[PDB]
Every structure is written in C-alpha cells, then in structure tokens.
Amino acid sequence: STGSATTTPIDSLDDAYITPVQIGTPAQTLNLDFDTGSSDLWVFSSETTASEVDGQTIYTPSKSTTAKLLSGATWSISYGDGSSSSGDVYTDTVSVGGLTVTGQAVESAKKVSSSFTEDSTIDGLLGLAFSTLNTVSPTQQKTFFDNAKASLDSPVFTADLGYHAPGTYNFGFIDTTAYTGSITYTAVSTKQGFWEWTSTGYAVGSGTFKSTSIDGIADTGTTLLYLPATVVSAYWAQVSGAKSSSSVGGYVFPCSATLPSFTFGVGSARIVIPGDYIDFGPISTGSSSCFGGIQSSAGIGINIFGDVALKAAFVVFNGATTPTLGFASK
Predict the structure, then answer these.
(1) DSSP letter at 159?
(2) What domains are defined for the chain?
(3) Could you give the residue numbers annotated as active site?
C-alpha cells in the first residue's frame, strides 16, 4: 500500500504545516501537524477542556463506530517550545492520503497548553519519530508509520514541504518526479528516538564550504533551523545590522536586508536554503526588525534541522531495519 497527502502552511510565514487525516467511522477529518520530532498522535476532542478549545475541529470518539477506549492508558507530552498536552487514549481507524491503519492509538486531549488553544488551525499532532518516544502509559503505543510499515510497498515516508506553498507527505514510495538529481542517503542514530544524523558542514551565501560535523535531528514539527552558535554567528555576520536580541529571543535583522543563502552538507552533497526562506518577517506588526530563520541551538541541547532546512529539500525517512535519511534538491 501507499498514501499521499498534501500538506499546507498554516500562515504566510510557514510557521507550521497541516495535513488532513481521517479518523474513525464515519470519517472525522482533522488537520494535523505531522511531526518527525515526536511520536504521539493526539487530537483536540470532545474531551478537551472547553475553555481550551478555540476554533479547532475536534474528534468525538462516541460518534465513531470503530473507536474503542484503550482502558487505563494516559498520555502527557511536553515539547521543545514549552507547550504541552495530555489526556486518555482510544484506538480507531486512521487514514492518511488513502493509507489506512486500523487500531491506531488516537490520543484524546483532556488538556492543552495556551499555545495550542491559540492556534485554531492545528487540530493535533501526528508523530513520526521513533515509537520509543511515545508517551502512552502504561503500555507504550506505536506511531502511524510504525503501524503502517509492514503493509507499505517500501518502509519509507517522504517530506516535501513547500516554501509559502503546499507540499506533500508520501508513505510507502519515493516519487522520482518530485526532486532533481539524485538522493543522498546518510546514517541515522535512533538512540534518542529521533531521526538524528550528521551534516558534513555549511556555507554562507557564496562563501567557501566549511567541512565540520553537525549532529542534529530532521524535525518537521520545528519551524526554524537551530545550529551551533559559531555557525549561526557566521551566518548573521553577513547581514548588515543583524544582531542577537535577548529581549526578542534570537537573531533579528533589518527588514530592508537581502538575506544570503545557507548551504548544508549531506555527505558530499549540498542543500541550498535560499535567503528568502530565512525571513520570518517583522517581530511585531509594523516593525522594521525582522526575525531570523536560523537561530542558535545553544541551550536546546540538540541541533534541529526544522522546516527552514527541510523545505529546501525532498527528504526520505527510510524506516528499513537500519534507518537512514535521504536528501535531494528539488
């Protein structure tokens, strides 16, 4: 089997991407944030504290003939941005782009933090990291991909995120029309539960490539590119007037700037992020200070190849017995 679904930016900045997901019988379609940095499929629901729902579409398990309470199971998750959610668990039928999994754990939120409430466009998350990170207790649950894997034509999924445009998540096949040149594969460590890999270096604009190992995670659920302070300083030093602002929470730059590109290495291959991808616009409405899309990972504890990086590539998440990651230009 295979599946193919379009993923759409939630706003004009590509802050996140939503993908329609069918849950239950008859189908309830919710727009979920596919997140290769976590491993829980959770949804706003009829159980979510009413004051914490503001415009989201909810899953109502009592209206699904295939929903079953997973008795005794609870979940609770906290994300890198400080947001969180928790609740109980149902199993139900879940379909993505025509690919169906029966008995998928659908984690129903009883509580969500303010950041989730305040974003009416995201109805929940669909985790695509390794199932070892799943938070369901006392019986850990598998991700949608893990459950689908054996049925897939090939044990892979691909992320093809757009810049200010829709893109695609495919399951079970590699669309050879969706990228240019060849795909370069690189080793993955699953030791921390992430799609963790080592970039071979970087360049800023038309500058020379610096060969240096940068361990980080491929994370579709993180908006920006978070890299070591040395690398980030080298990038922003090429933008007149750019500076790190503790008050704003990272590097800002004059909105009048033209940003240089940023290249990262994948083995001997190179992925070029155009400068425009690094512009996250005014820090507040009407400001002439703009927020940068490359930020320091210092104090996160891990480097994160988030959407800014991933959307410059066609990315293969190869879930074979020994997982790997593939990157192609597009």
Answers:
(1) E
(2) 5-174 (2.40.70.10), 175-330 (2.40.70.10)
(3) 35, 199
